[PDB]
């Protein structure tokens, strides 16, 4: 039978008999990670004689 209309936004959809629900449980989750490391070491020695 079906033909109970389900509206998501303006669009009314006909739910299949097999489907208990399809529903717009809309959600989102953005994860950003930025780890920068620098190291420098810089050694000089100038032994000199006359």
């Amino acid at each position: 039978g079906g033909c109970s209309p389900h509206y998501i936004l303006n669009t009314r959809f006909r739910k299949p008999y097999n489907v208990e629900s399809y529903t717009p449980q809309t959600q989102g989750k953005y994860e950003f990670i930025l780890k920068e490391y620098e190291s420098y070491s810089d050694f000089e020695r100038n032994v000199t004689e006359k």
């Binding site: 809309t26 959600q27 989102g28 989750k29 953005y30 994860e31 950003f32 990670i33 930025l34 780890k35 920068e36 490391y37 620098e38 190291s39 420098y40 070491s41 810089d42 050694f43 000089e44 020695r45 100038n46 032994v47 000199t48 004689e49 006359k50």
Partner: protein
Amino acid sequence: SSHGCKELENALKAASGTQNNVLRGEPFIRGGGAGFISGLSYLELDNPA
């Protein structure tokens, strides 16, 4: 006559530098259009709110 003139130099340099720069962000949304969710939850590092 006798003469003797003796010179030494011994320069040394040692430089070290370290940076750590850690940035973390987790925008989370429920509700609203999937496109507005993904547009808003995308972290803009110059305007993180």
